[PDB]
Write a protein that binds this ligand. Structure first.
Ligand code: O5O
Ligand code: O5O
Lengths: 305, 305
C-alpha cells in the first residue's frame, strides 16, 4: 500500500554529470562515452543576449576555451560541435560509467525524473511532467542549467530533457538531448512566456485508479457517460480532451479494478462539478495530473529497474 | 524558482542493495563492507508468526542457510548474528562500492529518502517523514522489506530506516539500522495498530516560508501572536506543540524572508481557522508538513551532496 511521487533511481545518471566552464559561465554537462552535452548558451556573454548568433560565437572558440571537470579530474576537450541548441564537446576519455542509454523526445503529458545538479554535483531528484504548454514545473536555481530529465525502462536510461531557462512565471523550459526545445521557446532574451496550460485528463484518471487500488472509493458512483458528454464537461473545466487512445491506455488499470474507463469518467465529471467537499484523495485535496498510467502500474505492481 | 518533494540522489545507496533468501522467504539487504543487514523476520516461517522466539530460530540456522545475491554474483556467508530486530550476515567479500556512512536514529518530524527495492533491485526513490506516531506513509509492496531510508550531509550516507512491516491502515513501520523499532511496534503478529497522528507544526511553518521565498504571499497578515496563544490554537487543530527550540530552528528562514516566526504563526492560525478559500500554496490545497526547515534551505539555496 501507499502512493508517492516516485522518481527513478538516479545513480546511473549521477555517474555522467560533469561541470562545463566557458569564460566566466559555469553549468552542468552530460558525459556519455567521449562526448559531453550541455546547453549552447554556455558560450554567450551576459551583454550579448538580445540576439546572439551561435554560429559566429562558436567559430571564435577553441578546444582550450572549455573547462570540463569530472569530479576531481579535468577532461581534455579534443573537439566541439553544435546540434540545434546543445553543445557537444568531444573529450579524449570515454566515461567508464556510461550506462546503456537512448535519447528520446517525449510528448506532453509524459513524466520523467529530474536530477538537479550544481557545479557537476547532484543535489536531489524529483518527478515532474511535460506540461501541455511544453513547460515543466521543476525546482531549479542558478547553476542548474544542464541538469537532465530521464526515464528508465529496464537497465536503459532514456534521457528526454536538458534544462535551459526559467521563464518569468517561475516555470522552466529546455530541450531534448538533441537540442530541440520543447514548445516555441528559444535560447535568447525575448518577451516569450508560457502559454495557457490545461490539465492532463488521462493522468487524472490514472491517479483516480491508483486511489481505488489503495482503498479510496468515496468518489465512485453508479453512473456512466459517453466520450462526447465527458469531453464537453472537460473542456468547460480546462481539461485536455480525452481520446479513444487514452481510453485504450487506461485498459489494464480498468481490468485490475473492474471499473470501466467511462465509469471512471463519470466520477471525474462529478468531482469537477461538485468538488471534493472537504475530502482528500491519496492525501491530496486537488486532482493530481502528474501520474501517467504507466507510473501507476509501476508503483502499484512494483517493477524494478 | 519552484518547490518539489526532493529526494537525495540514490546512487550511493543503490550500490549497497542485495537480495537475501532464507528458505522460501526473500527480501532486501544492505551490504556495507563485509556485513549484510536485513530484517530478522527473514528467518521466520509463515505458520510461526504469533510469537516467534528469534534466539531459538537463529541457533538452528547455519551459514549455508542464507543465500545472498548481489546482482549476478552470489555472496558466501561466513557468519551470522542478531542485533535487536536486524540480522547481520558477515560475507567473505567487502563491498567495493561501500560509501562513507553512519547509522542514525532520527526524531519524529524528520525526513528521509526511501529507496524502494524488490529482489535487490532498486525500483524508485521518494521522500517521506517519520510521523509523530512513529509510522511512515511510504509506498511499499510485497518484497520491499529491507529497503532503507537515508539522508546525505556531504558525501556521507546517514541511514536511518529499514522497512519491516505494513500496518492494517496501510502505513509502514520499521527500525533504525541497529534494529530498534521506531514506536511501540514489534516484529510479530499481534493486534498492534498505528496510534493517532498529529501535524508536524514546525514543518508547516517551514513550508510556509518556502512559499514566501517562491512568491506566494496571499496568506500573510499584519498580525502577531504569542507562543502560548498559538499553541492553544494548534492543540485545537491536532497540531504538534511548537517549542522555543522550533522557533530557533526557523531562525535562518525568518531572516531570509524578513518575517518573524511569531508573525508566520499568526498566518498559520488564520489558515487553520478559515481554511484556504479555494486558494493553493505551492501547488497544494492542504498544509504540507513533510518539509523540515533544512529541506527548505536545501532546495531554496541549492546545496549539493
Ligand atoms: C551569462 C551567459 C548567458 C546566460 N546564462 C546563464 O544565465 C546561466 C548560466 C549558468 C547556469 C545557469 N543556471 C540558470 C538557472 C536555471 N534554472 C533556474 C534559474 C532561476 C533563477 C536564476 C537562474 C536559473 N541560469 C539562467 C539563464 C536562464 C534564463 O532563463 N535566463 C533568462 C536562467 C544560468 C543566459 C542569459 C539569457 C538566456 C535566455 F535565453 F533566456 F535569454 C540564456 C542564458
Ligand atoms: C513468511 C515469513 C515471515 C513473514 N515475512 C513476510 O511476509 C515478507 C517477506 C519478504 C518480503 C516482504 N515484503 C513485505 C511487505 C512490505 N511492505 C509492504 C507490504 C504490503 C503488503 C504485503 C507485503 C508488504 N512483507 C510482509 C511482512 C510485513 C507485515 O506487515 N506482515 C504482517 C509485510 C514481506 C512475516 C509475517 C508477519 C510479520 C509481523 F511482524 F508483522 F507480524 C513479519 C514477517
Amino acid at each position: 500500500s501507499g502512493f508517492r511521487k516516485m522518481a527513478f533511481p538516479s545513480g546511473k545518471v549521477e555517474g555522467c554529470m560533469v561541470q562545463v566552464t566557458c569564460g566566466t559561465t559555469t553549468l552542468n554537462g552530460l558525459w556519455l562515452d567521449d562526448v559531453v552535452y550541455c546547453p549552447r548558451h554556455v558560450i554567450c556573454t551576459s551583454e550579448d543576449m538580445l540576439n546572439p548568433n551561435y554560429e559566429d560565437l562558436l567559430i571564435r572558440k577553441s578546444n582550450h576555451n572549455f573547462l570540463v571537470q569530472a569530479g576531481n579530474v579535468q577532461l581534455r576537450v579534443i573537439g566541439h560541435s553544435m546540434q540545434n541548441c546543445v553543445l557537444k564537446l568531444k573529450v579524449d576519455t570515454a566515461n567508464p560509467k556510461t550506462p546503456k542509454y537512448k535519447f528520446v523526445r517525449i510528448q506532453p503529458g509524459q513524466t520523467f525524473s529530474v536530477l538537479a545538479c550544481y557545479n557537476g554535483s547532484p543535489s536531489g531528484v524529483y518527478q515532474c511532467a511535460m506540461r501541455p504548454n511544453f513547460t515543466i514545473k521543476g525546482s531549479f536555481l542558478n547553476g542548474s542549467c544542464g541538469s537532465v530529465g530521464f526515464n528508465i525502462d529496464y537497465d536503459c536510461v532514456s534521457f528526454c530533457y536538458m534544462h535551459h531557462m526559467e521563464l518569468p512565471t517561475g516555470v522552466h523550459a529546455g530541450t531534448d538531448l538533441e537540442g530541440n526545445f520543447y514548445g516555441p521557446f528559444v535560447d535568447r532574451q525575448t518577451a516569450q512566456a508560457a502559454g495557457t496550460d490545461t490539465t492532463i485528463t488521462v493522468n487524472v484518471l490514472a491517479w483516480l485508479y491508483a486511489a481505488v487500488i489503495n482503498g479510496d472509493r468515496w468518489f465512485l458512483n453508479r453512473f456512466t457517460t459517453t466520450l462526447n458528454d465527458f469531453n464537453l464537461v472537460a473542456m468547460k473545466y480546462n481539461y485536455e480532451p480525452l481520446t479513444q487512445d487514452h481510453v485504450d491506455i487506461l485498459g489494464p488499470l480498468s481490468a485490475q479494478t473492474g471499473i470501466a474507463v467511462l465509469d471512471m469518467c463519470a466520477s471525474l465529471k462529478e468531482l469537477l462539478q461538485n468538488g471534493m467537499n472537504g475530502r482528500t484523495i491519496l492525501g491530496s485535496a486537488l486532482l493530481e495530473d502528474e501520474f501517467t498510467p504507466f507510473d501507476v502500474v509501476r508503483q502499484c505492481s512494483g517493477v524494478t529497474f
